[PDB]
Amino acid sequence: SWDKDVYPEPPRRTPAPSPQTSLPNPITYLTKAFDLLVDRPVTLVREFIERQHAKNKYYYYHREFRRVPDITECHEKDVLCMFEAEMQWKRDYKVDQEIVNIIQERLKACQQREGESHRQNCAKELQQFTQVVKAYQDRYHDLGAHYSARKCLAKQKQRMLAERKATKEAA
């Protein structure tokens, strides 16, 4: 499976039907025929493959890193300091795109689960989604295509400088 903290669901609910008819229920006949025709040979196939790979194993590890300090603690030129700093920043940009992908997956999940009961029990996800995407719009958006890391720093200085000057002369 996965981590149900990070890919959560609402709890499952199933109601019990109750005929009120005496046909009785042809789809029950068909799902029992499906179970006995299909579900047992598929289970035997996966069980054989389970044993055949349960003989011997491999492994793989998720790659982790150290931390280079920052771009701001490199000098004017620093060809080999900025290299580490900017590739670390670009890997953060990659993992951050995938964070936005995961949050949009959650939003689509709440849309398709709740049916037409949207605005009850999905406003939490739209709220946190507009939160995280307002952060992304503020930070990574208007930096063009030849981003390295330095334009992000210039946009950062520009944004906090404009907000500081606005709140100072309106304070």
Rounded to a whole number of angstroms, the minimum distance from the CB of residue 27 to other proteins is 6
Question: Of the two residues 138 and 164, which places its CB atom closer to other proteins in the complex?
Answer: 138
Q: Please note each residue after which the chain is broken, C-to-N distance over 2.5 A, or write none.
A: none
Rounded to a whole number of angstroms, the minimum distance from the CB of residue 140 to other proteins is 9
Rounded to a whole number of angstroms, the minimum distance from the CB of residue 149 to other proteins is 10
Cα 44 to Cα 38: distance, rounded to the nearest angstrom: 10
Which one-letter amino acid corresponds to residue 80?
Answer: L
User: Would you give the DSSP letter of residue 80?
Assistant: T
Question: Of the two residues 92 and 164, which places its CB atom closer to other proteins in the complex?
Answer: 92
Question: Of the two residues 38 and 160, which places its CB atom closer to other proteins in the complex?
Answer: 38
Contact 71, 88 (CB under 8 A): no
The encoded tokens of residue 141 equal 């958006």
Question: Of the two residues 148 and 152, which places its CB atom closer to other proteins in the complex?
Answer: 148
Rounded to a whole number of angstroms, the minimum distance from the CB of residue 164 to other proteins is 17
Contact 165, 144 (CB under 8 A): no
Other C-beta atoms closer than 10 Å to the C-beta of 148 total 14
Question: Of the two residues 151 and 164, which places its CB atom closer to other proteins in the complex?
Answer: 151
Rounded to a whole number of angstroms, the minimum distance from the CB of residue 70 to other proteins is 16
Cα 134 to Cα 8: distance, rounded to the nearest angstrom: 23
- Angle, helices 123-139 vs 150-169, to 10°: value is 100
